[PDB]
């Protein structure tokens, strides 16, 4: 898969063509860049990238699209805006977004237009897509233009009506349309191929570009130390952790949802439960030894596991930071899943294995509690790794792309 004509990648604090065809790439001052290959497009005049290139072609990239402002839903749903435009003599292609939709458009020499789109729901309790890094691939031959999302075919339309399409036009990365000053788009790994990629090729590219040295947060950004995170359980999506009133255990409650009338939108709240923080660059990696802490009022507390553990599962101990011979404190963060994910696991060790952190039904009538469990130790070795297991967790920081 060297069939790449443009490969925009980070190098020496700049975005450049690493294809070997050496396209001229101009990044303007208003674009934000990091060494993790992310670049942000804002509403500012000088937030653009300009590419001067040197029917059977493909375009791949990742994207993180901000959640709708609850008060401005109508603009969101109506107002379309271009993010990438490649035109010459009024002919070429453009990638545009209209609310919860991403749109691919081809225009021929005679101004003839056909479009294909992907629409993600804005009524889901927990969305895989909203404000989260996901993978987009767009293939084109003589017959069909189709969109693949995270390696899976989603959309497909016939284009045999369309005449000649001049696709060697200058590529402008820029927000264009009826946009709020607040509007932004994150993108990474923008590539053009001179062939229709197969589904097999795209699953392989998705899995390659899914890998990183470091663990990731809920949004698909790198998991950090000394950073405040709400906690998400992949096995119990609609649950969260709350400290039991004036006690030392973590009870599991159901997330609240959107309250206002507007029946265009539904979601569960993410900024609910205790604000956790991971203790020992400030980047969290596989097999790292950590302390899992949280803030109780304005004092930093800790998640401990009781060393007297004859039962298969037991409630975790939430208390002030204090060394006790009765309690395990050292957790090792794990990534058992071989397939793409933002989930990690939490393993208490002494070097034996005591149990994994999860959620379980304890009797008192029954109730759900934040627990260690020996059960998970066997399940994580089974293949394929089950992504809906209770021992799979995700960290949600505050993000300007998600206001609730």
């Amino acid at each position: 898969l060297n069939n790449i004509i443009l490969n925009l990648r980070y190098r020496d604090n700049n975005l450049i063509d690493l294809s070997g065809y050496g396209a001229n790439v101009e990044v303007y001052d208003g674009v934000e860049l990091n060494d993790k290959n992310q670049f942000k497009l804002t509403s500012s005049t000088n937030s653009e990238i300009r590419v001067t290139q040197n029917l059977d072609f493909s375009v791949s990239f990742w994207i993180r699209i901000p959640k709708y402002k609850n008060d401005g839903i109508q603009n969101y749903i109506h107002n379309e805006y271009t993010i990438i435009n490649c035109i010459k003599n009024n002919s070429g292609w453009k990638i545009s977004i209209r609310g919860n939709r991403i749109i691919w458009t081809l225009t021929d020499i005679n101004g003839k237009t056909k479009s294909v789109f992907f629409e993600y729901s804005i009524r889901e309790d927990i969305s895989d897509y909203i404000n989260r890094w996901f993978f987009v691939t767009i293939t084109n031959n003589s017959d069909n233009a189709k969109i693949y999302i995270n390696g899976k075919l989603e959309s497909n339309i016939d284009i045999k009506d369309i005449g000649e399409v001049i696709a060697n036009g200058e590529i402008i990365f820029k927000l264009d349309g009826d946009i709020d000053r607040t509007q932004f788009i994150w993108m990474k790994y923008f590539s053009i191929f001179n062939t229709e990629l197969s589904q097999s090729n795209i699953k392989e590219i998705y899995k390659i570009q899914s890998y990183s040295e470091y663990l990731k947060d809920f949004w698909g950004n790198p998991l950090m130390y000394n950073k405040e995170y709400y906690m998400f359980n992949a096995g119990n999506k609609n649950s969260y952790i709350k400290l039991k009133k004036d006690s030392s255990v973590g009870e599991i409650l159901t997330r609240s949802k959107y309250n206002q009338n507007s029946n265009y939108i539904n979601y569960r709240n993410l900024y609910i439960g205790e604000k956790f923080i991971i203790r020992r660059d400030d980047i969290v990696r596989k097999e790292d030894y950590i302390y899992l802490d949280f803030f109780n009022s304005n004092r930093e507390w800790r998640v401990y596991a009781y060393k007297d553990f004859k039962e298969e599962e037991k409630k975790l101990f939430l208390a002030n930071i204090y060394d006790s011979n009765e309690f395990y404190k050292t957790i090792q963060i794990k990534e058992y899943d071989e397939q793409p994910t933002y989930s990690c696991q939490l393993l208490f060790k002494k070097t034996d294995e005591i149990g994994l952190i999860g959620i379980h039904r304890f009797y008192e009538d029954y109730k759900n509690y934040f627990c260690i469990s020996k059960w998970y130790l066997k399940e994580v070795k089974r293949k394929p790794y089950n992504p809906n297991l209770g021992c799979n967790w995700q960290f949600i920081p505050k993000d300007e792309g998600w206001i609730e």
Partner: peptide, 14 residues
């Protein structure tokens, strides 16, 4: 303070 929390933890374990 830690003691008073550990007891409450023991009460929950019951």
């Amino acid at each position: 303070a830690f003691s008073k929390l550990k007891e409450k933890f023991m009460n929950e374990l019951h």
